[PDB]
Amino acid sequence: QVQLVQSGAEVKKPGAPVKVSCETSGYRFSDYNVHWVRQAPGQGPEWIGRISPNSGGTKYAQKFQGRVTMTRDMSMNTAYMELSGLRSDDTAVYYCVRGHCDGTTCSRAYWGQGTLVTVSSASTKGPSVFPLAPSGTAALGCLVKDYFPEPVTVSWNSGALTSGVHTFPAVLQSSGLYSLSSVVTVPSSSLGTQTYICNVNHKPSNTKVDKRVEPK
Amino acid sequence: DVVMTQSPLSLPVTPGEPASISCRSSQSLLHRSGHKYLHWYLQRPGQSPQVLIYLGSNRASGVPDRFSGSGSGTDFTLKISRVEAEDVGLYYCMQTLQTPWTFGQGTKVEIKRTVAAPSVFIFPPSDEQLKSGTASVVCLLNNFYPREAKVQWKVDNALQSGNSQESVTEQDSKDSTYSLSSTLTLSKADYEKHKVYACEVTHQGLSSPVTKSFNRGEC
Numbered sequence: 001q002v003q004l005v006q007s008g009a010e011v012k013k014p015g016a017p018v019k020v021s022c023e024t025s026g027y028r029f030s031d032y033n034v035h036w037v038r039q040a041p042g043q044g045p046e047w048i049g050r051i052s053p054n055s056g057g058t059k060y061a062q063k064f065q066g067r068v069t070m071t072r073d074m075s076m077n078t079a080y081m082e083l084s085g086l087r088s089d090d091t092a093v094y095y096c097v098r099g100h101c102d103g104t105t106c107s108r109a110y111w112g113q114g115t116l117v118t119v120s121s122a123s124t125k126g127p128s129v130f131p132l133a134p135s136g137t138a139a140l141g142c143l144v145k146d147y148f149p150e151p152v153t154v155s156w157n158s159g160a161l162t163s164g165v166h167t168f169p170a171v172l173q174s175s176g177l178y179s180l181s182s183v184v185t186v187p188s189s190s191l192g193t194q195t196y197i198c199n200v201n202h203k204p205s206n207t208k209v210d211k212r213v214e215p216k
Numbered sequence: 217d218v219v220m221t222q223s224p225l226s227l228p229v230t231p232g233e234p235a236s237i238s239c240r241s242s243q244s245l246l247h248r249s250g251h252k253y254l255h256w257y258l259q260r261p262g263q264s265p266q267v268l269i270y271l272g273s274n275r276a277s278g279v280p281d282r283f284s285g286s287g288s289g290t291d292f293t294l295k296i297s298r299v300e301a302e303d304v305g306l307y308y309c310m311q312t313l314q315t316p317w318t319f320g321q322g323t324k325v326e327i328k329r330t331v332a333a334p335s336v337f338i339f340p341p342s343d344e345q346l347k348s349g350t351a352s353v354v355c356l357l358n359n360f361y362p363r364e365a366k367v368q369w370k371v372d373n374a375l376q377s378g379n380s381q382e383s384v385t386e387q388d389s390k391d392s393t394y395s396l397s398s399t400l401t402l403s404k405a406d407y408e409k410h411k412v413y414a415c416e417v418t419h420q421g422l423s424s425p426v427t428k429s430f431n432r433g434e435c
Contacts, residue, residue, distance in 0.1 A: 035317065045308065047317040061316045095264070100271070100312055106251055108276060109312075111264035132339040132354055139337040139356055143345070143399075166358070168397045169383040180383075181397045183337075183356055216435070 002026045004096055006112040011149045011204065012119050017084040020115045022096030029077040030054045033099035036070065036081045040092040050099070051079055086119045093117075118149040122176040126207035127152060129200050132183065134191055135215040141183035142198035142211055146173070154182040155199045191215045218242055218311050222320025228328045231392070235296040237323045239309035244289040245272075253313040256285055256294045259306040259322070268307075269294060301327050304387045327392040333421030334360035334396070338414075338428040341407060351407035353400040355415035355428065359393040366418040367398040368425075372410050376400060407432070 007021040022034060036048040049060035051070040058070045064083070072079045079096060096112040127147035134140040144152055154167045167182040182198055192215060200209045219242040229235045245253045252272030257265040267276045269285030272292070282297045296303060304327055309320040334357035341351040357365055363384065369376035382398040398415065414429035 035315075037317065044321060045310070045319045047315065050315060059315055100253070101249075106249055106253075106271060108267050108270040108274070109255070113263050128345075128348065130342045130345040130352075133342065137335075139339075139358065141339070141354075141356075143342075143352060143354065145345075145350075145352070166385050166395045166397075168385060168395075171381040171383055171399070173381070173401075179352075179381075179399065181354055181356075181399070183358075183395075183397070185335075185358065 002110045004112040006115045009116040012086050018117050019082040022079040022112050024077045031102040034079040035097040038092040038094045091119045122148045124204050126205035129209045129211045131213040133216045137185050138188040139185050140213045143181050145179045146177040147202050148177050152202045218318050220318050220320045226324050228326045229299045230328045235299050237294045239292040239320050241290045245311050245313045254292050257308045301392050302389045329361050329392040331421045332361045336417050336428045349404050351402045351404050355398040357396040361393045363394050368416040369400045370414040372412050
């Protein structure tokens with residue numbers, strides 16, 4: 001099976017470089033170009049460039065000339081993208097993409113899962129988790145406050161509770177830290193009997209919290 | 217370079233109805249191959265975009281035959297024969313005839329359902345947060361349609377302007393509603409100075425605005 005898997009999320013200060021890897025399996029690495037594409041918040045996708053594995057030859061979009069270096073290691077079937085002089089608007093999800101054609105025939109592309117690169121003066125910080133307490137139908141939730149960078153994941157009752165859950169997009173507070181809420185509606189008849197726990201995970205700070213939410 | 221021109225930007229459709237998205241290229245995307253190098257994707261936050269149609273008209277495995285692609289040379293269409301609630305999302309065409317690869321503006325498929333009034337909930341700051349020295353008051357607008365809604369915060373009848381942040385979910389893939397969270401931020405000192413906290417909600421489904429409120433510290 002064709003597989004392209006990228007390195008994990010990155011957080012950088014302005015001016016720093018970032019290097020993202022794209023490890024492949026399940027196909028002849030030398031037969032296809034590897035492209036890199038990014039998508040920034042509120043922007044359309046952008047092609048960054050490509051490398052041809054067999055020759056090492058590179059081609060970059062004008063915008064990234066002198067900023068980006070694409071490489072590859074044949075023995076590892078892996079492509080790399082290094083972007084230097086990062087600015088705030090380099091904040092984006094970056095993708096590697098196996099090209100459509102092998103020089104003889106063409107078919108679909110195969111994409112990596114994406115790598116979030118956050119560029120910011122802010123420093124990594126874990127969230128505080130606060131209950132949004134209830135008291136027919138009741139709403140309850142968790143406030144996940146003052147963390148950096150994105151993302152956090154939130155589940156309810158270790159994934160057993162999904163119906164009626166809404167985890168909202170984070171807002172970037174004026175202090176450079178994020179805040180979000182996750183809510184769920186439940187029967188009031190169950191309050192004080194059925195336990196409701198929000199499972200919060202902020203991997204960048206290695207913060208995992210299971211918070212019970214109880215009526216006031 | 218190749219310009220890709222996608223239309224419409226927003227596509228509201230009643231479930232059950234067909235839909236069509238157009239994509240125009242500035243030059244033909246044909247025969248350096250046999251193929252038309254035009255592909256259609258569904259954006260999927262958190263993972264790879266989903267290939268729907270590739271090389272003009274080839275439907276990827278797993279994609280419902282409700283979806284189809286056609287076109288020749290410079291004008292292409294992605295067609296959905298019968299739109300379902302789960303089809304909500306952001307769709308792109310893109311060309312790979314040449315590098316740089318280039319992309320359409322994107323089309324947001326929106327499901328047009330009947331009007332649904334929001335169910336409004338208000339949450340005081342938790343004692344836990346207050347002990348930490350901050351106060352967030354949260355107002356929840358649940359399962360409404362259409363998306364347009366106004367939230368106004370009042371603190372002892374003083375209109376709050378600029379002290380709140382809100383965010384909205386994507387359209388629900390089953391019932392096609394939205395939900396919204398608004399957070400009013402105050403210092404604990406300021407929270408303790410006041411009594412009546414009120415979230416006033418304006419929406420098409422409400423004859424008049426609905427206010428949910430609480431009095432600080434009263435069970």
